[PDB]
Design a protein around this ligand. Structure first.
Ligand code: MQ9
Ligand code: GTP
Ligand code: SF4
Ligand code: SF4
Ligand code: SF4
Ligand code: SF4
Ligand code: SF4
Ligand code: FES
Lengths: 183, 219, 110, 60, 780, 124
């Protein structure tokens, strides 16, 4: 979009700041509960809390309007195609929140039936522990996603950030090699 | 035969599935027998049920159809013979004295170590009018996993029979369409079978990983 | 038991099994790690879940792990009624019917 | 870690010695990791622990 | 098979005369609690845990010691309330002094004490008094840590170390409540079978120092396996956590190893992770060995091997599964069109190959461990069972204790292993063995039916020895077996990995055999030229007449002339090495391929008796076996080796089947005259100690620290003739170099000095470059 | 011309393993192989958008975005997309590898010859 073709000076910086503000303040979820965590997501929207406070009252039913995907449940094998279809049918920019141990890494259900993390099928912006994560934890994760969104580059800055992140990522030793005091 | 069904034969003490972690303890041979047929005076209404069944069926038909009767923990299991299942189920549902209207489903259970009887389908039946309940059990081999479907007698079974097939491969012949219900149609294998691996992945940790529970030791 | 450092084993139990009671220690260790081993056998037990007769077929092979645990979840069987309660009606009415069934899909798919 | 249904705890024990002692007794947990993307918060770990070394806070 | 019938509890059974009540109750499905009992140990009835009520008996009787009499009636804790009370009281008394150590005890989770206190114990303590206490742990060796408080004093460790192994270096000591298993003062436990005690202890009293605090049972991936180390082929159980092997328990295979190991098999598993492992294919460039891709490496190896064509020899080594040896042999036959194949990475001879073709190859499952136990007379030629195939020693000792097996050893001196067998030495200087065998044709002990003659691999080194042994076996009628020292030797022979042999034992010189293998290989015809032994191959390559070598898992230091072998590999223009670890060959080779170790590959060994010992890959890894490496090297070369996996190799070996035709002729080699050593010189005798400096024992300092201290050995006459005294460092020497070890004056033939073949500081081949039986100078 | 292969994985060791299975010249009857390594989904996507790749190897186990998801995305988003090979961390993942529409799937741990043969089949 033209908003990203601005020169890398103050115009682009301020546009990035305002766009990040707006996108963090209007982060409509998709009406895409899966399991236990879906019930806790409804509880988060419920009056005891108020997800609407964060501009997130509109659980968008159509993927087109939804800017955020709270996976919030366990992605079976037969659901991964559907979950990916819904993700791809949101219009960019879009972020994905792996709510719960099931969504983030497969959780306790380390089995054939479960994909072991939606990361397998869709990029994950934030991982959220819990089984289910209580609504306060969901709000915490959503606020961390707000922080991620606000500090978001655009245009030439987006390309520079992708290059920097790629270079940094190539160096991290894999988790299996971080042998500490483990003999 | 009245000898029990041995679903497994434990070798050694402490439930070792293999040689064992201490020497000299592996020589025990403990077969894992399910309860054998109850002698005769079945507790409570069970006799009242079975006798009635034996009345509605003939002596010859009853003997050919009912392979075993097992009362365990005040629960009545009728190990029915394959092939004869639809007739027995029809008798149970229709007979006013039995009138087991509600079949609650079908559950497959796999006993690879039970020769010729590897796959057991369990039918929990309940009679609301008589406030009774029993469990039919039909055993089929692995090489011929075909069982007669009860659809004409219990439509509720249609999905259960499907899931049980999907999960065990028990072919309910005569079922309208035994399509997989839970797993994708292109899925290979029947997960609830013991032969099917758990299909987990190692859990990651900084500098290590834990293999799934099916790989690590057990007792 | 709770304490200033959070929920944990009650310090009385820790004292019992780590300072005094050897049989207590063995029982804690084995019941926590291996767990009880159930006598072999089958049993179908039902409860009146909010959505209907939630049945459980349980099979034990004499071991510390269950041999079989099959849930006859009421929601799974109730969903056989989508055809009956939706066919012929309006789609808006089909939504109401499906809601009335109150299917919780976790139990349906297990 | 034994009791965890999710295999969410990884523990490696090591010897306490005079030159370096971390716990009373002969053993201590040199490595202690919890994979919180596998932990289901069940609490079985706590009930399993025989020293009350493991507790559950209310921090979430 | 007199069967006695008795009722245990209510039920009835019939069992062999002499069977113990505990065994019968096992057979009928009844778990009588037991600690001190052991099926393979003579009953002791010490712990009194296994008490049962027996009809007509006032006292409870230890079921582990009560021989079954006809018509007896017995009621266990399942039906006798009195027996239940007895067992539960014994359990309580067993736990009062026991430490509250379960969280910190390694045996936790696998403890028979825990399990039987659950099944047969009181819910909680009744003991409010003070527990007995010992300072713990205390090492009884470099490997074994003793925790006396946890010791239930069952004596199973002591009873094993006396009955099963002749190693009573621990015993029950002190008295009364203070009784404790202990070593003498500081003399370490020091037994090649010490690990068995760790596996035999029903509690955490004896633990492996290597395995200490490493893991709990639930954290272990456990797999069946076979030991890699000698031809005994013991069933073992490999346990690995975090992808690292943590221990190798003895498993259970009554037809092979009962429930026993040696320390080598039990603990020598770290070799694959000592940091010298070859992780990626390596290529020689600019004289430096560089990491390389598989594609590039195979390209280069195929180029070199095709350039060398039939001017190549394949050294298969003895560290190969039967499938791996078969692939090496088939690769040599077709892919290289050569017969220069030899798995012998050791002292060896042409007479050895002739004998192996004549009597061993193709003759599976003849003499068996069970037969050993009942052989009235066992003769040993060039074979130290304790040092070579320790489980053969265990079976021979079992036969000695049970069936009066009489053992005879043609050896220079009574080895500790032989003494534990109550065996009789036939003192003879190395090389003079054929005379000993020829002097035994009239021996009445061998004429007894079921007599056995075990020939060690070292017997090949002596000219005329193997033919002499074959003559003796034929003349006396005793069954003759040949027991190598490496697990892959017998599998290699069955794989036709000798210059004169093809798979199934059929000889290369037989045209019909060549046709059978060519058909089974869907190929025109195998090479007809006689192959070159390993010594021939090495001497040829050192001459520059060899165009390339394919060395699979061979340590040159083990060859008779290691200097010659290093020269041979260096001068060879193109050397392709399939090695698990960096070595002399890998250092000097041009292309290096990594091959998966035994823990991470499927396959099978053959033990000396010919019994197959198959195993699945316990570890799953990107690594590939020698099978796939050779198969894909051949594919790049453009020939279908048709061995994508061990399963295919097994299928092909089954297809080729046994030869069944005209068995190859016997060796019949002439017994050449032995050299005579003058003053200041003696004939060298040696054999590899079990716990020597072998490459596969690397990375396990405890096991090494449990090795027997290397020593030279001499007759007091010969030590005096050299002017040495017991304990003084005697030096033997030859042109290559010298070996210096403390002198241990030994009852043995004069003019003979015995050194460990490859013990630390000995390395007789590397240091001296001579085989056993060679003349070597001596001095103070 | 040299073939460019995009190897995607955030695990450096898996990338090195793939680069080992495939030499600079796999199947010497084939052109030289050039490796561009990427450890992030956005970079992998951008490199694909640049185009000119003969094959892309996507680690199905990539942490922040699996190689199967990236495979489906690249097939949905790049016209004339190059054939995709996937490394699957589980045998049961095969079905998802089928759904990812990758021309082939190689289970972990990377078997060198299997991966080389798969690649040669795709790049031929
Ligand atoms: C010096 C001085 C005084 C200068 C003043 C200059 C000035 C400020 C100018 C004023 C005049 C203007 C604005 C002229 C500029 C040109 C102009 C008009 C541009 C328009 C551009 C455009 C088309 C769009 C950009 C945004 C914009 C400002 C548009 C007009 C305003 C609005 C509000 C438009 C769209 C937003 C809207 C009405 C709906 C968004 C969608 C939804 C679903 C809304 C939120 C929402 C709804 C509605 C639910 O139903 C709901 C129910 C239950 C739970 C949650 C929700 C929920 O979240
Ligand atoms: N190709 C191949 N090499 C192996 C294999 N296993 C071990 N090796 C290598 O073979 C080399 C020689 O092994 P050995 O001849 O048994 O030497 P050792 O370990 O001292 O054993 P001993 O002969 O009993 O002394 C070692 O350096 C290992 O790296 C294998 O399975 N395949
Ligand atoms: S992570 Fe736990 S709470 Fe969330 S859906 Fe899965 S099982 Fe339910
Ligand atoms: S709460 Fe504790 S026991 Fe439960 S899953 Fe998490 S770490 Fe394991
Ligand atoms: S030996 Fe057994 S009972 Fe004693 S502390 Fe160890 S695990 Fe517990
Ligand atoms: S150390 Fe073990 S085997 Fe030896 S007496 Fe004590 S408990 Fe028995
Ligand atoms: S005797 Fe040989 S095969 Fe048996 S465990 Fe010991 S080293 Fe291994
Ligand atoms: S087992 Fe019989 S007295 Fe110990």
């Amino acid at each position: 979009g033209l908003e990203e073709r601005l020169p890398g000076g103050i115009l682009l910086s301020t546009v990035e700041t305002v766009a990040g503000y707006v996108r963090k303040g209007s982060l409509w979820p998709a009406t895409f509960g899966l399991a236990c965590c879906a019930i806790e997501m409804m509880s988060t929207a419920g009056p005891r809390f108020d997800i609407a406070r964060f501009g997130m009252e509109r659980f968008s039913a159509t993927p087109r309007q939804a800017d955020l995907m709270i996976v919030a449940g366990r992605v079976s094998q037969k659901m991964a195609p559907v979950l990916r279809q819904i993700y791809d049918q949101m219009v960019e920019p879009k972020w994905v929140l792996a709510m719960g141990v099931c969504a983030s890494s497969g959780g306790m259900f380390n089995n054939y039936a479960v994909v072991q993390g939606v990361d397998h099928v869709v990029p994950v912006d934030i991982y959220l522990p819990g089984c289910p994560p209580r609504p306060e934890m969901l709000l915490h994760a959503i606020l961390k996603l707000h922080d991620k969104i606000q500090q978001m580059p655009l245009g030439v800055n987006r390309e520079e950030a992708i290059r920097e992140a790629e270079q940094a990522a190539l160096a991290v030793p894999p988790t299996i090699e971080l042998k500490g005091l483990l003999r | 035969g009245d000898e029990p069904e041995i679903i497994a034969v434990r070798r050694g003490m402490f439930g070792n599935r293999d040689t064992g972690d201490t020497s000299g303890y592996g020589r025990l041979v403990r077969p894992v027998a399910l309860p054998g047929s109850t002698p005769r005076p079945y507790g409570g209404y069970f006799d009242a049920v079975m006798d009635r069944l034996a009345e509605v069926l003939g002596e010859e038909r009853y003997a050919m159809s009912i392979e075993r009767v097992v009362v365990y923990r005040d629960q009545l299991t009728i190990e029915v013979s394959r092939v004869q299942l639809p007739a027995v189920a029809s008798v149970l549902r229709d007979d006013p004295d039995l009138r087991f209207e509600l079949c609650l489903g079908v559950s497959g259970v796999h006993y690879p170590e039970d020769t010729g009887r590897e796959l057991h389908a369990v039918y929990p039946l309940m009679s609301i009018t008589h406030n009774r309940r029993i469990q039919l059990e039909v055993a089929a081999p692995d090489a011929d996993p075909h069982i007669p479907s009860l659809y004409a007698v219990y439509p509720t079974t249609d999905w259960h029979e499907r899931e049980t097939y999907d999960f065990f491969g028990i072919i309910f012949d005569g079922h309208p369409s035994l399509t997989r219900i839970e797993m994708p149609d292109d899925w290979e294998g029947h997960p609830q079978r013991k032969d099917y691996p758990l299909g987990g992945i190692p859990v990651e940790y900084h500098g290590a990983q834990i293999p799934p529970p099916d790989q690590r030791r057990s007792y | 038991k709770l304490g200033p450092d959070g929920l944990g084993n009650s310090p009385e139990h820790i004292a019992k099994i780590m300072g005094r009671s050897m049989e207590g220690l063995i029982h804690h260790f084995k019941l926590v790690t291996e767990g009880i081993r159930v006598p072999p056998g089958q049993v179908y037990v039902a409860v009146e879940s909010p959505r209907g007769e939630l049945g459980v077929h349980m099979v034990s092979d004499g071991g510390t792990r269950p041999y079989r645990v099959h849930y006859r979840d009421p929601s799974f069987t109730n969903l056989q009624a989508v055809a009956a309660t939706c066919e012929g009606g309006m789609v808006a009415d089909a939504i109401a019917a499906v809601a009335s069934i109150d299917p919780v899909m976790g139990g349906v798919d297990r | 870690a034994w009791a965890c249904p999710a295999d969410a705890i990884y523990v490696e024990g090591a010897d306490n010695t005079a030159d370096e002692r971390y716990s009373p007794g002969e053993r201590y947990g040199r490595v202690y990791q919890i994979n919180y993307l596998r932990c289901i918060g069940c609490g079985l770990c706590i009930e399993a622990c025989p020293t009350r070394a493991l507790t559950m806070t209310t921090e979430y | 098979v007199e069967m006695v019938s008795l009722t245990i509890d209510d039920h009835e059974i019939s069992v062999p005369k002499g069977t113990l009540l505990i065994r019968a109750a096992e057979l009928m499905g009844i778990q009588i609690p037991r600690f001190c009992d052991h099926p393979l140990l003579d009953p002791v009835g010490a712990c009194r845990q296994c008490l049962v009520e027996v009809e007509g008996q006032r006292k409870p009787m230890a079921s582990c010691t009560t021989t079954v009499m006809p018509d007896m009636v017995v009621r266990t804790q399942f039906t006798s309330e009195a027996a239940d009370k007895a067992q539960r009281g014994v359990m309580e008394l067993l736990l009062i002094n026991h430490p509250l150590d379960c969280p910190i005890c390694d045996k936790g989770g696998e403890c028979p004490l825990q399990n039987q206190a659950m099944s047969n114990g009181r819910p909680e303590t009744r003991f409010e008094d003070v527990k007995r206490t010992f300072p713990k742990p205390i090492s009884i060796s470099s490997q074994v840590l003793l925790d006396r408080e946890r010791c239930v004093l069952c004596a199973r460790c002591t009873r094993f170390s006396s009955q099963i192994a002749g190693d009573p270096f621990i015993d029950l000591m002190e008295r009364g409540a203070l009784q404790q298993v202990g070593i003498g003062q500081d003399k370490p436990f020091q037994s090649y079978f010490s690990g068995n005690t760790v596996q035999i202890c029903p509690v955490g009293a004896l633990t492996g120092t290597a395995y200490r605090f490493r893991a709990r049972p639930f954290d272990l991936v456990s797999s069946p396996s076979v030991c890699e180390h000698c031809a005994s082929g013991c069933a073992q159980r490999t346990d690995h956590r975090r992808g690292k092997v943590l221990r190798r328990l003895a498993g259970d295979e009554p037809e092979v190893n009962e429930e026993w190991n040696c320390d080598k098999g039990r603990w020598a598993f770290t070799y694959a992770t000592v940091g010298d492992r070859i992780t990626t294919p390596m290529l020689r460039d600019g004289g430096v060995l560089r990491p390389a891709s598989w594609s590039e490496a195979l390209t280069v190896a195929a180029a070199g091997l095709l350039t060398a064509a039939g001017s190549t020899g394949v050294l298969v080594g003895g560290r190969c599964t039967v499938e791996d040896a078969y692939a090496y042999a088939k690769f040599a036959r077709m892919v290289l069109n050569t017969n220069d194949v030899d798995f012998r990475a050791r002292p060896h001879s042409a007479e050895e190959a002739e004998f192996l073709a004549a009597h061993v190859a193709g003759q599976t499952m003849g003499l068996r461990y069970a037969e050993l136990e009942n052989a009235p007379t066992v003769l040993l030629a060039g074979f130290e069972p304790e040092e070579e195939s320790p489980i053969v020693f265990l079976r021979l000792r079992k036969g000695v204790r049970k069936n009066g097996v009489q053992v005879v050893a043609v050896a220079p001196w009574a080895s500790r292993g032989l003494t534990k067998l109550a065996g009789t030495v036939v003192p003879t200087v190395p090389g003079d063995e054929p005379a000993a065998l020829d002097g035994m044709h009239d021996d009445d002990r061998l004429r007894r039916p079921g007599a056995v003659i075990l020939v060690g691999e070292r017997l090949a080194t002596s000219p005329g020895a193997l033919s002499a042994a074959v003559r003796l076996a034929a003349a006396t009628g005793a069954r003759l077996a040949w027991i190598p020292r490496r697990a892959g030797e017998r599998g290699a022979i069955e794989a036709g990995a000798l210059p004169n042999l093809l798979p199934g034992g059929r000889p290369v010189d037989d045209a019909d055999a060549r046709a059978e293998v060519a058909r089974a290989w869907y190929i025109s015809a195998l090479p007809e030229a006689p192959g070159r032994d390993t010594a021939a191959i090495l001497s040829t390559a050192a001459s520059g007449h060899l165009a390339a070598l394919l060395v699979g898992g061979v340590e040159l230091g083990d060859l008779p002339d290691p200097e010659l072998a290093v020269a041979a590999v260096r001068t060879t223009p193109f050397v392709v090495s399939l090695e698990l670890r960096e070595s002399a060959v890998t250092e000097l080779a041009d292309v290096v391929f990594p091959v998966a170790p035994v823990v991470e590959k499927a396959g099978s060994f053959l033990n000396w008796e010919g019994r197959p010992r198959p195993f699945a890959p316990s570890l799953k890894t990107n690594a590939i076996p020698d099978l796939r490496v050779l198969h894909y090297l051949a594919d790049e070369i453009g020939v279908d080796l048709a061995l994508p996996t061990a399963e295919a190799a097994d299928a092909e070996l089954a297809q080729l089947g046994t030869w069944g035709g005209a068995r190859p002729p016997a060796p019949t080699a002439p017994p050449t005259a032995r050299p005579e050593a003058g003053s200041g010189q003696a004939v060298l005798a040696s054999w590899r100690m079990l716990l020597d400096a072998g490459r596969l024992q690397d990375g396990e300092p405890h096991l090494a620290g449990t090795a027997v201290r290397p020593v030279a050995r001499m007759s007091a006459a010969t030590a005096a003739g050299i002017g040495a005294s017991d304990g003084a460092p005697v030096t033997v020497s030859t042109e290559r170099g010298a070996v210096t070890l403390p002198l241990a004056v030994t009852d043995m033939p004069d003019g003979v000095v015995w050194l460990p073949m490859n013990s630390p500081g000995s390395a007789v081949h590397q240091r001296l470059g001579v085989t056993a039986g060679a003349v070597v100078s001596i001095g103070a | 011309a040299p073939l460019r292969i995009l190897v995607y994985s955030d695990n450096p060791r898996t990338r090195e393993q793939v680069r080992l299975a495939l030499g600079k010249r796999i199947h010497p009857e084939l052109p030289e192989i050039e490796y561009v390594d990427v450890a992030t989904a956005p970079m992998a996507i951008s490199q694909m958008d640049a185009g000119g790749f003969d094959l892309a190897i996507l680690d199905g186990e990539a942490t922040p975005a699996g190689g199967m998801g990236v495979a489906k995305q690249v097939k949905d988003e790049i016209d004339d997309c190059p054939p995709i090979l996937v490394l699957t961390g589980r045998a049961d993942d095969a079905w998802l590898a089928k759904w990812s529409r990758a021309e082939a799937a190689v289970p972990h741990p990377i078997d060198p010859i299997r991966l080389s043969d798969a690649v040669v089949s795709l790049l031929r």
